[PDB]
C-alpha cells in the first residue's frame, strides 16, 4: 500500500496496517525511548539498507550492496567474486577499508525549534531552511557541546520534510569495523542481472553477509584484532514459515528521493524533456554499440558493461513514460492541485493557487534551457566517450589521463561511430546559435558533414591514437596542443554544459519555496494520513501484501518464483544464466531440507505491494509478527512511475525469499555456524 | 485432449467427450446415412477448413485462408485488402477463379475390400498399398461405372490410415462457384501477424466470409449469373453465450500430417538433422538480413516479407526442439516401443521388434545423406537467392527469368552478404569430397576465401547486375554463357541437391513397410481408443476444453483475450499493430451491443486443449451443444511438438471468439444482412 512513512507516523497508520494483517504491538515495531525492531535496521555503507540477524552482530544485505567488498578481497588465486566466500570461523571474517553501518538510535521532532531559529533569518527568500550546513549548526547547538565526548560513536543531524514544514533530528550510531562473512557465487547473486534488470518474475539470490565488530562493551571501534562481535540490542528472528498469497508484509529502510508533490506541469516537463531526451539519445547510442558488439567478439567484451549501464536508466525512463501514458499520472497531479485550489478559494486564502502558478511559471520559463541541458548531457557528456578526453613532468601527467581515457575497454572506431550518430541527432535539435562553439565547425568548415568533422578530430588529435599520443611527446609543441581538435571539442562542450547548469541553477529555488506553501496547504486540507513526505534518505516504513499482478491483457504474474524457474532459464554459454553446480545438484536431488514448501517446490523470490525506491536495496522484509521473511532487492519497471504516483495494480517490490537465502548458506556454502547463530523460528 | 479422431471413432470416444462436457447426441454430430453437423464442415480451397453458417450457403473461414481471393479483387482504386470488403447485397458478392469447397457427403470403411484386392499384387514389398494412383483405381471400381453420370458434383477417393492397416472411402461433393462476401480490414485480419506468429496471448480477428452458389436444386454448377445461393442440408447455429474457463470445446477439420508413431531413433534424427540444421542456417540467414534491414530503410521494405517467411518454420523448429529437450518426447516414444517389444516377446511374435530395428537401421544408414541434404537445402537452395538464378528469341526468354530473379525486392549486395555467411557455414560442415563441384573452387582457386569467390561470381556473371545482363545481349557470346560463374554455381548445387534426393528416396520404403507392422502391433496390443491415426488431410474431430496454461515459472496465460489487449498493443507506426479507426471508436464508446461479457469486456480470442495442426485453419469450434463459438486459426509454439506427442499442459489451439467476429461484421462492416441471415442463438 501507498507511502514511505515516518516512524512518528506509525500511530497514524497502525489501523490500516492491521486491516492488512499486522499482528505486532505498535511499541515492538517502533518506540521513542526503548528497544524496538527499528534498532535491527542499518544504513549500510552510505546508500543500502541491511539488517541485524543474530545476537553476535551478523548483518544481511544484497549481493549488489556487498559487491565492492567481495571484489576487493578477490584475487585470481582466491576469486571470491566467482566462487562465493564462506568464512568457517569468526577469525577468518574479512575486514573492509572505509566501510560503515549506521543505526538510528534516536529520532526526535524538532520542527518548533527550527522554525523559531529560522525567525532570525531576516530575508524571507533565504534557502537556509533546506541548507545542510545551517541545519547541522542547529543540530550541534541542540545536542549541546561535549556531545561527542559524552556519547561514543554518536552523531546528530537535522533533516527537512514536507518541503520544510517538518524537521526531525536523528541520532546516529556509526560502526566502521564491518567484516565480510559470507557471499554466494556471482552466478547466484547476479542471476539474470542485466537481462532481468527491473523484471518480475525474478530468480536472483541477491544476498551477502557481514558482521559488526566493536569493543568489549559494544561501542564503535576502528578496526583492530582485539575487537569482538557486537552484541546488539535487537536482531531479527528468521522465519521458516514462508509466505502465501495475500500475507502481510512490511519493510523498513532508507529510500532516497520521490516526487509525490509534483504539479501537473512538472509531470509534463519530466516526460517531454528529461525522459523523452534520455530515451531518444540512449536508444541511438545503444543501437550503435549493439551493432558493433554483434559484429565483433572483442567489442562485445570491451563494451557490454558500458552497454548495460546505459540500459539501466534507459529502462527506468521507458517504464516511467509508460505510466505517464497509460496510468493517469498527469491527471492525478492535476486533480490534487485543483482540489487544493477550490479549497483555498473557500478558505479565502489565495496563496496555494499562487504557489501552483509560480511553479507552472518557472517550469515554462526554464523550458528551452532544460532541453538544451538534457540534450548536451545525454547526447555528448554521457553519450560521446571523447568528450571526456584529456584537457591540459606534465606530459607524464597528461599520459596518465590519456591512458585512462583510451584504456583497454575503449575502441576509437566505436567511439567515432557513436559520435557520428549522437552528433547528427544533437545538431538536428540544437540550432546553430545555441551550439557549443566547436560544433559550429560542422556547418562552417565541413559543409554539414558530421563524419568528416569527427574524422578530422581523430586524424589530427594527439589523442586520436596511441602512436599519435607517443609522437606528440616525444616532441611536444605547445603550439600543436592549443589547436588540438579533440581538446577544443572537449572544452567547448563542457563550457556550454557548465554555462547551462549555471543559468538553470537559480530556477530551482522559486519552485522549492512554492512547494513549501503547496505542501502546507495540502496538509492543512487533508492531513498526513494519506500524504506521505517525499523520501530524503531517512528511515521509513512501508506495508503491503504478498501479491502478484497482471502486466497486460490475459497474462498474470504470481507472487512467488521457484528454483524450477532458475533451471528453466539455465544457459551455460551466457554468464548471467549460469547455474552453480552445487545448486544444480541440490535441485536434481531435491535436497531442500526444511526450506521448501509442503509440495516439494523450493522458493527463490517473492513480490509485494509495498512502496519502495532506490535506497531500499537490502531492506528487511517482515511478516505479520515482525519476523524476517525476505530481503528487498529490486522493483518492477511497471512500478517506476510510483516515485510520482503509487500504482496499486502494477508496482511491486521484488524480494529474495529468506528460505532461499538459508538454502544457499546451507547447501551451497556449507556454512552451518551461520545458521546455528541465527534465531530461526517456525 | 489427445487425438485427431476418425468420424468412425466417435462411438469409441463418446464416453470421454461427455466426461469433458459434450451434451450432443452422437447421431447429431456424425452419422453414416443421415444429416449431421459433419455436413456443415467444408474443405476450403485445397487446404483450409471452413464452415456453413446460414441456410443460404454462407461460409466462414480465416482471413489468411481468404487472403488470395480478397487480394485478387483489390485495386488501388478499391483496396479491399486494406479496407475490408462488405457486399451490401447478394448480387455484389464477388466470384472467384479456380476456387472450391468440398463437403464430405459419405465415409465408408473399405479395409476388407482393399486388403482383398492387394492379394493380387504378387510382390510382398510393393508400395501400391499407399499409391494414390492404385487406390483411386480401386475407388473407381467400387463406385461402379457411370458414377459421375449418376451423381452430379460427386467424386470418390480411398485413403490409407494407420500405416496401411485401415482404408476409408470418401464421397466428396465439390462446388466451384464460391463468392467473396465479407472481409475485415487487414489491420484486424492480420493484427500482429508476424510478431505474434505462433503466440498466445493473441489478438487477431482472423476471419473472412464466402457464399456457396449452385443450381436451382443445390447441385454444383460452374460460375454463372443464373446460379443461386446453396440451401444447405445443415449449417451451424451461432452462439452468443460465449465461453468460460473449462467449457467443453470441439473442432472438426482437415489436419495434414502428424508423426505419432515415430520411433525413438526418428525423434533423434528429427532433432539432430532436420531441426538443428534448419535452426542454425536460418539463424545465420536471418541475422544478416536483419542487420541490413536495420541499416537501410529501402532494404527493410524489400526484405521484410522474405524475412518473415523464413522466421515461420524457424520458429516452429525452435518450439519443436524445445519440447524434445524439456517435455520428454524421445522418452515417450522409447517407452511405446519397449512396451510393444515386451508384449511381442510374450506373444511369441518377434516381428514387432524386427520392425523397430528395421526403422532404427534405416535411419542410421541414411544419416550422412540426410545431413548433406538438409545442409544443402537450408544452406543454399533456400538460403542463397542466386542459387535460383537462371540456367539456359531465347534471350528474351532468359531476360524474363533474369527479371524475376533480380526483381524489385532483390538486392545483389544483401544476396552476396547472405551467401558469404551461409557458404562459410556450409563449407565448414560439408567436406571437400562431398561438395557440389563449383564450391571446390573456394579451396582450389581462391585459397579458402569465400568473399573473393562470391565477389568473382557477381563480377563476371551476366546476371551479376542489369548492365551486365544488358551488355551480354546486346552481344551474346555462347561461349561466355557456358563459363558463367553463376550458371555453373546454380547448376552445380541443384545437381548435388538432385542426386542427394535420389539416393535418399529409396530409404523411405523400408521405414513405411515396418511402420505397417509396428502400428498393427500397437493396435493389436492396446486398441485404437488412445492411439489416433496419423493425420493425412482427411476429416477429423478433436475435443478438449477452454483453458489457459503456464508457459514458465510464475507466469500464467488465461483462456480469453480482450479488446483491451488490442489497444494495449496499438502502434500506429508498425503496420501489424495498427488499430482500425472504427474499431478504435467502438472501444472508446463501448459500443459492444450484445457481444461483450456482463462486465463490459469485449472478447477477441480464446484457447483450448484441442489437438490441431496445419490444415485446421478455419475449423469451426463448437460448444457442448454443437453451436459455433469460434473459428480456429493458429496454435502456440509450445505445442508444435504435439504433432509427435500431445502436450496436455502446453499445447493450445488459438481461436477467434465468434462474438468478436459478429462485432466486427456489425460495427466495423455495417453488414447487417449477414447477421439477419444467420441463426444466432442464446
Ligand atoms: K534495478
Ligand atoms: K527514486
Ligand atoms: K502459425
Ligand atoms: K503438421
Short mmCIF file of C-alpha atoms in Angstrom, two decimals, chain A residues 199-203 291-292 294-295 325 551-566 568-570 607 650, chain B residues 199-203 291-292 294-295 325 551-566 568-570 607 650:
data_model
loop_
_atom_site.label_atom_id
_atom_site.label_comp_id
_atom_site.label_asym_id
_atom_site.label_seq_id
_atom_site.Cartn_x
_atom_site.Cartn_y
_atom_site.Cartn_z
CA UNK A 199 11.97 -7.62 -14.28
CA UNK A 200 9.40 -9.70 -12.40
CA UNK A 201 9.40 -12.73 -12.44
CA UNK A 202 12.89 -12.75 -10.97
CA UNK A 203 15.23 -15.59 -9.89
CA UNK A 291 25.50 -3.25 -33.85
CA UNK A 292 29.27 -3.24 -33.13
CA UNK A 294 27.24 -8.17 -32.65
CA UNK A 295 29.73 -7.65 -35.47
CA UNK A 325 0.99 7.49 -20.99
CA UNK A 551 1.12 -6.86 -16.61
CA UNK A 552 -1.12 -6.92 -19.71
CA UNK A 553 -4.22 -8.45 -21.17
CA UNK A 554 -4.56 -12.18 -20.25
CA UNK A 555 -1.20 -12.53 -18.51
CA UNK A 556 -0.73 -12.95 -14.77
CA UNK A 557 2.45 -12.99 -12.77
CA UNK A 558 2.07 -14.75 -9.44
CA UNK A 559 3.58 -13.83 -6.05
CA UNK A 560 6.36 -16.47 -5.80
CA UNK A 561 9.15 -17.76 -8.06
CA UNK A 562 10.87 -21.10 -7.63
CA UNK A 563 14.09 -22.94 -8.32
CA UNK A 564 12.32 -24.67 -11.19
CA UNK A 565 12.44 -21.15 -12.78
CA UNK A 566 16.20 -20.89 -12.38
CA UNK A 568 14.29 -23.22 -16.96
CA UNK A 569 16.49 -20.14 -17.52
CA UNK A 570 19.77 -22.02 -17.36
CA UNK A 607 6.82 -9.82 -4.59
CA UNK A 650 1.27 -2.62 -11.01
CA UNK B 199 1.97 -16.65 -29.96
CA UNK B 200 -0.64 -16.88 -27.21
CA UNK B 201 -1.96 -14.44 -26.00
CA UNK B 202 -3.27 -13.44 -29.41
CA UNK B 203 -5.50 -10.55 -30.59
CA UNK B 291 21.49 -6.38 -39.90
CA UNK B 292 20.85 -4.99 -43.43
CA UNK B 294 18.22 -2.13 -39.74
CA UNK B 295 20.99 -0.33 -41.62
CA UNK B 325 14.67 -31.01 -24.78
CA UNK B 551 4.36 -21.17 -20.07
CA UNK B 552 7.11 -20.88 -17.43
CA UNK B 553 7.73 -20.45 -13.75
CA UNK B 554 5.24 -17.98 -12.16
CA UNK B 555 3.53 -16.89 -15.37
CA UNK B 556 0.00 -17.83 -16.37
CA UNK B 557 -1.79 -17.18 -19.60
CA UNK B 558 -5.57 -17.26 -19.23
CA UNK B 559 -8.18 -18.67 -21.62
CA UNK B 560 -9.57 -15.41 -23.12
CA UNK B 561 -8.11 -12.24 -24.66
CA UNK B 562 -9.98 -8.97 -24.96
CA UNK B 563 -10.17 -5.78 -26.97
CA UNK B 564 -8.37 -4.04 -24.12
CA UNK B 565 -5.38 -6.18 -25.31
CA UNK B 566 -5.62 -4.88 -28.86
CA UNK B 568 -2.56 -2.04 -25.31
CA UNK B 569 -0.68 -3.31 -28.39
CA UNK B 570 -1.65 -0.40 -30.61
CA UNK B 607 -7.69 -21.03 -26.41
CA UNK B 650 1.23 -26.73 -23.02
#
